[PDB]
Curated annotation (Swiss-Prot):
Cited function: May be involved in tissue injury and remodeling. Has significant elastolytic activity. Can accept large and small amino acids at the P1' site, but has a preference for leucine. Aromatic or hydrophobic residues are preferred at the P1 site, with small hydrophobic residues (preferably alanine) occupying P3.
Residues of the full protein shown: 106 to 267 of 470
Active site: E115
Residues noted as binding Ca(2+) 3 in the record, renumbered to the chain: D71, G72, G74, I76, D94, E97
Tissues showing expression: Found in alveolar macrophages but not in peripheral blood monocytes.
Residue sites binding Zn(2+) 1 per the record: H64, D66, H79, H92
Highest taxon, organism lineage: Eukaryota
Similarity comment: family membership: Belongs to the peptidase M10A family.
Positions with a binding annotation for Zn(2+) 2: H114, H118, H124
Stated name of the protein: Macrophage metalloelastase
Record: residues binding Ca(2+) 2: D54, G86, G88, D90
Domain comment in the entry: The conserved cysteine present in the cysteine-switch motif binds the catalytic zinc ion, thus inhibiting the enzyme. The dissociation of the cysteine from the zinc ion upon the activation-peptide release activates the enzyme.
Amino acid sequence: MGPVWRKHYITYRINNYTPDMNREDVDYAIRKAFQVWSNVTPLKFSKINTGMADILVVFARGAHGDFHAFDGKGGILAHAFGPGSGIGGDAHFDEDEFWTTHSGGTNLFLTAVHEIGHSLGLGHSSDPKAVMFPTYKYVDINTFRLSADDIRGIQSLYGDPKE
Ligand SMILES: O=C(O)C[C@@H](O)CCc1ccc2c(c1)Cc1ccccc1-2
Ligand SMILES: [Ca+2]
Ligand SMILES: [Zn+2]
Ligand SMILES: [Zn+2]
């Protein structure tokens, strides 16, 4: 067993914004990415704009204070820390990527779903169909669905939604 959030009500806050997409689009990509996970577990996600959140969403480039320096455009697109206190649960996106609403470059929604998986406690999958597969790949955001491995992985940690 590994660390999990010990409550079902989880807050997130967007620390700062990429200049690559307007605010509405960043907010929606992130909201929609939490929604993918909340759809298959008992978890509830809420955005806050003040106070300390459980999960901080940050856009940063190169070294940014966590011993895990980003590496410019390409390579690592983002990273996240599992459930814990302090930096635990936070999701960092490499500001050097070009973030898009679709496939124009690095899709934020898809990348966020993968990172939130990490913030919830999931590690990598060996199933090429899984969002937790280590390698980024675009899929139409209207056609996107967690794979069966993602769902069983997340439910083993938090159970399924209630009656
Ligand atoms: O957190 C990490 O492991 C580092 C990161 O560069 C991997 C980002 C990533 C990894 C995998 C995927 C995506 C993004 C988007 C996607 C859509 C559909 C299926 C898989 C993936
Ligand atoms: Ca990078
Ligand atoms: Zn970081
Ligand atoms: Zn990953």
